[PDB]
């Protein structure tokens, strides 16, 4: 009857400081508090966190980005805490107006402060990518996380930097707001015909649904075979046990083919990087090559015409 969804007994010992492969231990912190809720679901220990030079860079730039957007929101609220709470999710930093193009001459109230915040955010995100690469390297691991993050960065860069330059205007970029960037996506789909008829939109949606499908499948399988110690997959790769065998046989008797304890993770990483990569391509194509996706679909056998 136990479904292994929540832990039923929770044990604590000395905190684990981690490995020392070639990490600079002076740049680590201490262990944080233990948390019983996280212990119910997963691990209870918090920390230690590594903070080196790239971490200082990322923290400074991201803090400045968050602070710039927040101070703009406070200016819009009239420095009123009540108005700030009420109209939160309604404030936004807008990019420059279309008349200014790509120029950096737009005023602070119009689009200059958006440019400042965007510079801060660009630096923060690229330094965080460098941090993921260097943290993988210090421990001697492969850089799979860095390249998957690079896929995500590719979509972010297309949305905020690459497509506005190809279109020749900063006004093409995304505002910094909660409802405002949602309105931005709706207007983007409306201006460019119907984004449903962008085929790379369709591929991106296929791979998003595929991520949900695959990782429900995989989480359920690991939970189902965890009675045999299936969740310790790194040693099921080195020493195949009955858990991996039973998982493979379930999926082979069900859908005709199966995976390994490592090939399934290759499937996983590719299924997610593909959603973000195809999305980047589809957004870059919108407006620069196709200005009306429904008409493109009519010309390409996708709409009745």
């Amino acid at each position: 009857e136990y479904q292994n969804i929540f832990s039923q007994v929770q044990v604590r010992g000395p905190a684990d400081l981690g490995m020392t492969e070639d990490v600079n231990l002076a740049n680590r912190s201490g262990v944080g508090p233990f948390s019983t809720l996280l212990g119910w679901f997963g691990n209870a220990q918090l920390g230690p966190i590594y903070l080196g030079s790239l971490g200082v860079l990322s923290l400074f730039s991201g803090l400045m980005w968050f602070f710039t957007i927040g101070i703009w929101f406070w200016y819009q609220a009239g420095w009123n805490p009540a108005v700030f709470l009420r109209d939160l999710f309604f404030f936004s930093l807008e990019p420059p107006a279309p008349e200014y193009g790509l120029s950096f001459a737009a005023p602070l109230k119009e689009g200059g402060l958006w440019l400042i915040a965007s510079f801060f955010m660009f630096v923060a995100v690229w330094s965080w990518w460098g941090r993921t690469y260097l943290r993988a390297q210090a421990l001697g691991m492969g850089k799979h996380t860095a390249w998957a993050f690079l896929s995500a960065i590719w979509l972010w860069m297309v949305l905020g930097f690459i497509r506005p330059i190809l279109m020749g205007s900063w006004s093409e970029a995304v505002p910094y707001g909660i409802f405002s960037h949602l309105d931005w996506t709706n207007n983007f789909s409306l201006v460019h015909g119907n984004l449903f008829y962008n085929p790379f939109h369709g591929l991106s949606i296929a791979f998003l649904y595929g991520s949900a499908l695959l990782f429900a499948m995989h989480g359920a399988t690991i939970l189902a075979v965890s009675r045999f110690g299936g969740e310790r997959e790194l040693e099921q790769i080195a020493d195949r046990g009955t858990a991996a065998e039973r998982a493979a046989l379930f999926w082979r008797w069900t859908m005709g083919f199966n995976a390994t304890m490592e090939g399934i993770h290759r499937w996983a990483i590719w299924m997610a990087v593909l959603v973000t990569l195809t999305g980047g391509i589809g957004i870059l194509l919108s407006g620069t090559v196709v200005d009306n996706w429904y008409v493109w679909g009519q010309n390409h056998g996708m709409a009745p015409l």
């Binding site: 997963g42 492969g142 939970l223 969740e231 009745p304």
Partner: protein, 281 residues
């Protein structure tokens, strides 16, 4: 035919309906009672799709569409060429899905594993049934369901969304999208981490789960663990699908207006309703 380790697991037991009857394999597949049922329903649905394509007059697989009955039929039968085929295909699709889930249960109990996978699949079946059965039945007609076509069910999505203005102002929609995005992020991170531990720098030994724990503790200051990450993936996927089903079931049944107008209850709270500043003032 068999995997190098498959032979010892193929034993006579664990069926739900029938006994030694239907207790055999066809190639790699296991075909029980519900295997036969699944095959029948799926083949019938696929042939009926092809026959609907014949009726419609198109052979382009991207233009084939099977439409539900018009609103004038309500929740009753329709002529085959004018909505009856859609109803038959819906019954076949439901039967195929439910028989697939029951076949998976039979495989689970033949292999001695838990039934997490059929439960997770049942969540998706319930989302499909929400879109095709529960919401049309509450709304009063089969024509509120979506058509069976590659690019026309996207037309259904577009029209249904734009009936209520901009659709990602629906709150449960916001929750479902957040869960979907978080799930894709978690899947990418998990696959990358496992691969990087199993495939280190060239000439290195394999890493251990301690190295993975250390990698994410160095990166973000917290590691959820292996059991934790698999529980998280299952729950993120299921919560995404559950909240999508909810946001659709409340859409044409309780709500009827633009959702951006729903968000005005927060703005019109009595203690800041009339303060003159900001966006809504």
């Amino acid at each position: 035919a068999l995997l190098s380790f498959e032979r010892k697991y193929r034993v006579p037991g664990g069926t739900l309906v029938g006994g030694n009857l239907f207790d055999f394999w066809v190639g790699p597949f296991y075909v029980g009672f519900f295997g036969v049922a699944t095959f029948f329903f799926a083949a019938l649905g696929i042939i009926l799709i092809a026959w609907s394509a014949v009726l419609q007059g198109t052979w382009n697989p991207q233009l084939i569409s099977v439409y539900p009955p018009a609103l004038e039929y309500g929740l009753g039968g329709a002529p085959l060429a004018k909505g009856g085929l859609w109803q038959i295909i819906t019954i076949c699709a439901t039967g195929a899905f439910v028989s697939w889930a029951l076949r998976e249960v039979e495989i689970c109990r033949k292999l001695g594993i838990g039934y997490h996978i059929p439960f997770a699949f049942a969540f998706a079946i319930l989302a499909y049934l929400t879109l095709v059965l529960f919401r049309p039945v509450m709304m009063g007609a089969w024509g509120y369901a979506f058509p069976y076509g590659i690019w026309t069910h996207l037309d259904w999505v577009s029209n249904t969304g734009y009936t209520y203005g901009n659709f990602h102002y629906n709150p449960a929609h916001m929750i479902a999208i957040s869960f979907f995005f978080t799930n894709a992020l978690a899947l990418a991170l998990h696959g990358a981490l496992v691969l990087s531990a199993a495939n280190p720098e060239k000439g290195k030994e394999m890493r251990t789960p301690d190295h993975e724990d250390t990698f994410f503790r160095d990166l973000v200051g917290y590691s959820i663990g292996t059991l934790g990450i698999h529980r998280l993936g299952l729950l993120l996927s299921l919560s995404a699908v559950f909240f999508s089903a909810l946001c659709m079931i409340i859409t044409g049944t309780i709500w009827f207006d633009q959702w951006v107008d729903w968000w005005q209850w927060w703005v019109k709270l009595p203690w800041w309703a009339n303060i003159p500043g900001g966006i809504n003032g």
